[PDB]
UniProtKB/Swiss-Prot annotation:
It is linked to Microcephaly with or without chorioretinopathy, lymphedema, or impaired intellectual development: An autosomal dominant disorder that involves an overlapping but variable spectrum of central nervous system and ocular developmental anomalies. Microcephaly ranges from mild to severe and is often associated with mild to moderate developmental delay and a characteristic facial phenotype with upslanting palpebral fissures, broad nose with rounded tip, long philtrum with thin upper lip, prominent chin, and prominent ears. Residues 1-327 form the Kinesin motor domain. The gene is KIF11. Belongs to the TRAFAC class myosin-kinesin ATPase superfamily. Kinesin family. BimC subfamily. The chain holds residues 18 to 362 of 1056 of the full protein. It is found in: Cytoplasm; Cytoplasm, Cytoskeleton, Spindle pole. This is Kinesin-like protein KIF11. It comes from Homo sapiens. Interacts with the thyroid hormone receptor in the presence of thyroid hormone. Component of a large chromatin remodeling complex, at least composed of MYSM1, PCAF, RBM10 and KIF11/TRIP5. Interacts (via C-terminus) with the kinase NEK6 in both interphase and mitosis. Interacts with RARRES1 and AGBL2. Interacts with TPX2.
Length: 330
């Protein structure tokens, strides 16, 4: 049930000029990734895994979006709940994947940059889709980040990143949480997106001066909520609410990250079919507990490096990603 894809990034200019050796080969037609744990490219021992989809170094953002996100966006628009996670070591591409970057020299606008990642392609698509069709809809967004088991709002322009939100259980619906103070921002039109993100990109900067290795050690939850009051030609007014959470996890490398530790432990309990799952043992797992064995539809995108220095981290990721394939939800 939980879909897992592996994205492998190309050798960085640091490993480019250093003219090194790939220990990872990604076969998109075989949905398989293979790591060389031994030696010699003439004779080598290897480790091989199979996923739902693998994308090699030559994969572009649009490729990823078209293949994995687009189908999740369609389910969300229908009124369902979906979740996407980016898992993996630091410096392998979790952020390039969920956010993407800007092509240099102001070459493109935000909506056409080949480098844009999931989050911005999605926000744009939403408008591009519902706007056409005859629907009254509304988009809300939230960016909730976890650093050291403390909760932060990176979108609220009124309060600074030094003020942590509180989390309490939701008396109404069980297994839900209430985040006191989280700002939900309404995005009135496409040409109103980029600023919302620029503010986020700004506030995360101060968050970095305030907390060590923030960008590595924090988990961000980008949530977009769609309220659609559709009315097809028939004049049928369907009231749909779709929610999508885009999660860029802290770096899987190895103080302690209670949520990352709790995530893996939660995954274990679900694959090992154990009755007790430690959702409550971290903020991340309690917040997104429905994405993990609940009724949300979830995908994981693990990110790895071709580099041989990363061997250990790559097998740790490939492996962690592999077992999750066994989590069944919806
Ligand atoms: C304002 C801006 O340029 C951008 N803001 N982003 C952003 C902020 C956020 F709260 C949540 C999701 C996001 O997702 C998207 C990125 C990004 C770009 C990320 C730019 N980075 C921050 C600055 N950087 C450095 C190293 O200075 C590189 C990474 C983008 C936006 C639209 C189209 C393409 C790319
Ligand atoms: N698939 C890719 N193609 C090109 N550059 C990539 C790719 N994946 C990651 N990068 C780059 O490698 C670096 C690390 O990316 P980053 O998104 O910060 O990963 P992480 O968030 O896991 O640390 C950045 O320089 C980004 O440009
Ligand atoms: Mg990052």
């Amino acid at each position: 049930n939980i879909q897992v894809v592996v994205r492998c990034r190309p050798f960085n200019l640091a490993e480019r000029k250093a003219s090194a050796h790939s220990i990872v080969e990604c076969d998109p037609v075989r949905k398989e990734v293979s790591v060389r744990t031994g030696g010699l490219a003439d004779k080598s021992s290897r480790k091989t895994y199979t996923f739902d989809m693998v994308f090699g170094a030559s994969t572009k953002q649009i490729d990823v979006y078209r293949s994995v996100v687009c189908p999740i966006l369609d389910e969300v628009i229908m009124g369902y709940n979906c979740t996407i996670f980016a898992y993996g070591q630091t410096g392998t591409g979790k952020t390039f994947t969920m956010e993407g970057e800007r092509s240099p020299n102001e070459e493109y606008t935000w909506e056409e940059d080949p480098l844009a990642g999931i989050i911005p392609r999605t926000l744009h698509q939403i408008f591009e889709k519902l706007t056409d069709n005859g629907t009254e809809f509304s988009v809300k967004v939230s960016l909730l980040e976890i650093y050291n088991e403390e909760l932060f709002d990176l979108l609220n322009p009124s309060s600074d990143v030094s003020e942590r939100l509180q989390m309490f259980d939701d008396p109404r619906n069980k297994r839900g949480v209430i985040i006191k103070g989280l700002e939900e921002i309404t995005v009135h039109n496409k040409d109103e997106v980029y600023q919302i993100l620029e503010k986020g990109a700004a506030k995360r900067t101060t968050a970095a001066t305030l907390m060590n290795a923030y960008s590595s050690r924090s988990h961000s939850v980008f949530s977009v909520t769609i309220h659609m009051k559709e009315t097809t030609i028939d004049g049928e007014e369907l009231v749909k609410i779709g929610k999508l959470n885009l999660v860029d996890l802290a770096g899987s490398e190895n103080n302690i990250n209670q949520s990352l530790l709790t995530l893996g432990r939660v995954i274990t309990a679900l694959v090992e079919r154990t009755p007790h799952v430690p959702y409550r043992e971290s903020k991340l797992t309690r917040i997104l507990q429905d994405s993990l064995g609940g009724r949300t539809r979830t995908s994981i995108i693990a990110t790895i490096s071709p580099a041989s220095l990363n061997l250990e981290e790559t097998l740790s990721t490939l492996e962690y990603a592999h077992r999750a394939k066994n989590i069944l939800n919806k």
